[PDB]
Amino acid sequence: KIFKPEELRQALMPTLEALYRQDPESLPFRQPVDPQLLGIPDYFDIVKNPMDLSTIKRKLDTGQYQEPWQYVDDVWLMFNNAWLYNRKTSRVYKFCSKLAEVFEQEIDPVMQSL
Ligand SMILES: CCOC(=O)c1cn(C)c(=O)cc1Cl
Ligand SMILES: CCOC(=O)c1cn(C)c(=O)cc1Cl
Numbered sequence: 001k002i003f004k005p006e007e008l009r010q011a012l013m014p015t016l017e018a019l020y021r022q023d024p025e026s027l028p029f030r031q032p033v034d035p036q037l038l039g040i041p042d043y044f045d046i047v048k049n050p051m052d053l054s055t056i057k058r059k060l061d062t063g064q065y066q067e068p069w070q071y072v073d074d075v076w077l078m079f080n081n082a083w084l085y086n087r088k089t090s091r092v093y094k095f096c097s098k099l100a101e102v103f104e105q106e107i108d109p110v111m112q113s114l
Contacts, residue, residue, distance in 0.1 A: 001114050002067075002114060003067075003068055003114070005063065005065070005066045005067070008060065008065050008066075008067075008068065008071065009060050009061065011068070011110060012060060012068065012071050012107075012110065013060060014106065014110075015103065015106040015107050015110060016053070016056060016057060016060060018102055018103070018106045019053060019075075019099055019102060019103060019106075020053060022095075022098065022099060022102055024095070025095040025098045025099055025102075026053065026095075026099060027095075028082075028091075028092045028095060029052055029053050029078060029082070029095075029096075029099065030052065030053050030054060031052060031053075031054050032050055032052045032054065032055065033047075033050055033052065040085075043085060046084065046085050047081045047084060047085050049077060049081070050081060051074050051077040051078040051081060052078055053078070055074070056071065056074050056075065056078070059071075059074070068111065072107060072111075075103055075107075079096050079099065079100045079103075082095075082096040083096055083097075
């Protein structure tokens with residue numbers, strides 16, 4: 001079996017809600033990184049394809065995903081960007097690692113139900 005495109009929001013939104021529920025860990029991920037505002041002006045020199053929770057949520061609300069892998073792909077893009085840009089000792093890097101642990105715990109039982 002599969003999750004059809006029209007089933008994606010109902011099946012996958014709880015995994016995204018679980019990320020948002022992590023506070024403070026999700027806070028650096030809720031909106032697109034604004035390099036000038038955040039005092040990290042080299043961000044787009046390092047990160048080629050930004051991704052954040054608000055973008056994923058909009059795509060999941062508005063039918064922009066056709067298959068589960070596309071949602072999962074954007075989530076890992078968001079995490080990988082943060083592990084790439086931020087130092088291993090940094091708050092954002094460590095928050096990213098916590099969110100990834102939460103994501104794995106939430107997405108695995110959903111995808112393994114198929
Ligand atoms: C996936 C449900 O969305 C949230 O849980 C959520 C969404 N936004 C846009 C927020 O700013 C905060 C939360 Cl908690
Ligand atoms: C809202 C504050 O966000 C950040 O400070 C931040 C977020 N991300 C995802 C980064 O990769 C780097 C920073 Cl500095």
